[model samples]
Target chain A: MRKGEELFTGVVPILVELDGDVNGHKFSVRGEGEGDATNGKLTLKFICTTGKLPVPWPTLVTTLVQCFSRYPDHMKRHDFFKSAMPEGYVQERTISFKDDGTYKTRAEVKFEGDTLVNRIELKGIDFKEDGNILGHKLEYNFNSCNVYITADKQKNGIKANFKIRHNVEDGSVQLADHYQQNTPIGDGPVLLPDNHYLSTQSFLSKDPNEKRDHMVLLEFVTAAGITHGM
Target chain B: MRKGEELFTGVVPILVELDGDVNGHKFSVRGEGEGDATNGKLTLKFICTTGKLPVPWPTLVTTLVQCFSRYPDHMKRHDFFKSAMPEGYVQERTISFKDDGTYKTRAEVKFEGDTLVNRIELKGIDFKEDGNILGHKLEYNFNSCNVYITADKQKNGIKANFKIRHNVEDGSVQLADHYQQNTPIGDGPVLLPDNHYLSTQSFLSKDPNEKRDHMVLLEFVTAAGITHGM
Candidate 1:
């Protein structure tokens, strides 16, 4: 095998029993996964099922996970990952994108002390053309396929705006056809579990020196592949 | 509630029905998630349950998914996430630590012209002090709790090293208790479901630009919460 080659190509069930007690909040998420990976380019679309996470706050926690899942520092767990996961499974340390003049979706999740705030700066997206989704020729009959949500925890509860360009035609055509509705997360038909929740375990240190070799808690073995020379 | 207020505190099951048919393989991940979130900091330990992905390669996709799951780029879906996931379920944007920082677990995933490669970085470490694991730790009597794996797909298969510091005194100790061996993934009690695998849907663009608005393929509704002015 070369430096980067395909290892194993198949679907394997993965299970990681996490306790919000160890970290915080007794949270759990159940969802499906699909991916493509080599020795170098590894990718996964960690789709979320409805009402799966018992978070401290809905808007705050969801937004934060989405935003931080992109930073390299937040993903410096390759060693732990490789050990705990299958072969060819790894994380890229550096990532950069070019401004290709395309509509870029930009959202920010910031921690001001203990205060968390997030804002989506995507505006005026026009879906004025027909497109293909899952082989479904969805009409650009709607305005935009955009969704903008911003939330900040404050007095009473967390202030949030689960706004989305209500522009789908096939699923369910609501009275407010082509408009952005300010809804709350999990407010839709899919309600979240009232008991299960997620909580921040701890703030991690980025310094490699302060790092330790990973210890397998419960290594879920699967039909893994191999490589030539890493 | 104050800054970093707790808005939502419950469990929500998430499902992202992905397609290994999209990218390169029919990849999909099905697992459970537990989390905790606030206005500022949100965390989620996405626990993979089992095979549900149709990825291009098995070891590659699984390992990649595990590694990249921690990266902010992979998670920068906050805006898209905020709209797609539950409240407070967000990714941490910036991460760092001090020199003598905490036990910073490190991992790195990379893509070299589609040739994805990863290395378990962060030098050696030891747990000399008595620690608690799931609340079962009395003394420090184990070797290095470590794991080292690297794979590069090539001619016949992917060369890999799914090495782990099996320094535990419990669990399956097949003849090799205090040693590290080169093993393959998916080579355990649970064999992958043949013909039903997760393939590479395709490469994920980390760039914020080459992205589109998130459209709800399957909007599963559940019980939701609300705050003031949200």
Candidate 2:
């Protein structure tokens, strides 16, 4: 590891929703965390599920990891839920946006024990006849509460999977506001697991002559999504 | 580790330029590769020279690693230079860009046995007088050669430094290409070495339960710099 650089050694779970598939999939992330707090660590992995997920897994995973690692500051927004977590427990994750056709959503997530839960809020955004912007808010709660450590069962530490559901709902939206449509991502028993692990270790040069190579590696990792600040 | 994963093992060094100061610093990168040809591994490390570097070290390293890993196809571009390399020759790298100031530049590099060479190019970019669109052209070649690794003498496999010189110049621009301007990046006899080594070990789900954690690590690594293409 590079001097003053710390190793990232933790994992986050990702819940992916498929096109028209009510149930989504859950997978694990492996990498280093920035110490034990908010800034978070870097995540690198591949997506795999028992069923085919419709969203672009590679790009989606990339965008999601970047947002999560870079936005611990956003966790402040969730302070409202502070009273809800157990003592000595705090949530540090990210909230981000996703667009699908005429459908757009703002999503936030929190990992618990071995499960991950997501809150997806729908938005009806479009242009009015008068060229004005129209927006409406709809809500859905998706959860990947069931976590299974398949490693022990497989005895090879090669695969682990999770199940997801859209069981909680506090509100609804007007159907007439819709333009392009998508199959409702209802309750899924969709299953998935993390299929890859990228390292978040520090690189230090043995001496001055060997510095350039190390610099390139450092630059590449930053662009890839290792956050430096809180 | 995920299913069908590979191991990454090797280390490289970096040379950094400080504010107008000669004799910059050095560092190292340790990770795995994607077999012999395509799909490279993710790099995990930090930057630490004799003195700290001025640029954003974390992000820069991440970016460089990802670009190099993803562009082996770019190595094919070097196929034309194949005959020039030593026997048992392996073209194991890629070159790219970085943003600093109004003076933007793209850099490419290749590491030989005892020395690493850089091909630095300068570009003139500006907006058109019509205010409709802007365009830029690539011109001039300023090479930072004469970099030789001084590692073997160290014996400890640490503290290797380089000696550099400006040996190649096709054209010279007025020192005043200055628009906004940046501090001169003076000669760097600065000394340094590799510190941290990141693992590029593939993560396979043990079963179905330990999957999410593994998945996120994989995704982060992929985004950080691991590539799956040739």
Candidate 3:
């Protein structure tokens, strides 16, 4: 909410204790938005900052079946689909406008010190749909990088779902942490392959043979709270 | 290609001069594979190494059209779509099996040193499709993290297309770099937002007002070479 120099920060906290890590690592995003509801575009000025992320991705909580002890070799590899490890003094992650020029995607540099900036606009359609799906009891897209923002009229706050991906050349893609949070709309990273809302621990087990012990289980959080806005 | 007691390395080198930096940062993957195509799945013993990467995402080349000078503020942020910045000492980017349990996706730990590993299995269908799409791709995915492999019937080599992605909560996604290389496959990383095969520089300009100057043009490469295979 941009009431008076007050735009809430979007944070994706790692909720579960994955493989070798205990959890608490987060992907922090600082964003400001402006919308012309009638004109059909939501101008989103967002910056996903990893400067504070210890060493980048600490918990390797990518897939569910992956166990630190079991798949040691599997543990050494890393993918880009959704890992928010800023690799430079200034890098970018963006979705350019379509060949038909539907949208304009740009990853520009704002500062020279250290950071990456992604500035783009989404159709008013996608944002509304996300609100509808969660509030209206509903809905969705092919947007390379999608930012779904829904307004909680009841709480007068913002509920957001952020999905970050890396599209490969063959038209397919690799995934990162599907961070759907509200600080408020708390559906942390997408751990499972099929189910984005659930972590791998929710569906499968590390043992591959039996369901997880659930003893040192993870507590997945949703709707933690609503992002305060103007 | 692996011989008696040898296992080769699969690396994704960022070949073009992108928005911010000039290029040279690579997604180094240490992978070893064992397959019995005659039977069914190809057991991929691989690791995606990112510790050596600087901050995580330096060459923020998500969808082309992005320029560091053109969009300064846009350059101060970052995304996880296809970035190779490893956050934790161990983090993962993976694709899990279908709810139907087709393939296995795991983010495991091989060594306790500062690194992340992703170990998973892909069916012969997809890998072959990639090889075919390129060697033949002549061929495609719904798979979360897809690694395509094709045997160069002509050169007796391996042509690969690596697609990484993070599927969001609503089934949509955020994209990462689409690294297709033969190191050998040659299609570097997907820069264009739409046509993953091309960079934004290939389609549009930095000066949204006017086309980019041909003087600072980028040269896109394809079929760089072939990954030597057994």
Which one is best on DockQ? Answer: 3
Q: For model 1, what is the error of residue B62's alpha carbon versus the real structure, in angstroms, after optimal superposition? A: 15
lDDT (Cα, tens digit) per residue for candidate 2, span B1-230: 11101111223332222111111223222222222212333322222233333222211221222212222221222211111221111112121211212223333333335222232323323323221111112221121111111222232121212221211123322121211111112222211222211122221111234212111112122112122121
Full-model lDDT for every candidate:
0.20, 0.23, 0.21
Taking chain A by itself, what TM-score does each prediction score? 0.20, 0.25, 0.20
Q: Model 1 segments beyond 4 Å from truth?
A: A1-106, A112-116, A124-126, A133-230, B1-189, B194-230
lDDT of 2 by residue, A96-198 (tens): 2222122233333334443333434332233232211122132221112212222122321122232222121234312221111111122222122122211
lDDT rank, highest first? Answer: 2, 3, 1
TM-score of 1: 0.17
lDDT of 1 at B101: 14
Q: Model 2 segments beyond 4 Å from truth?
A: A1-8, A17-104, A115-117, A123-230, B1-9, B14-112, B119-230
Ranked by lDDT, the better of candidates 2 and 3 is 2
Q: CA shift at A95, candidate 3, in angstroms? A: 28
- Let me know the TM-score candidate 3 reaches against the reference structure: 0.20
Between candidates 1 and 2, which one is better according to TM-score? 2
Of 1 and 3, the candidate ahead on TM-score is 3
Query: Candidate 3: global Cα-lDDT?
Result: 0.21
Better of 1 and 3 by lDDT: 3
Q: Across residues A39-153, which tens digit of lDDT does each residue of candidate 3 receive? A: 1112222222533322112011121111111101121122111212221011112222111111111122121222223322221112121222112211011122223334334
TM-score of each: 0.17, 0.26, 0.20
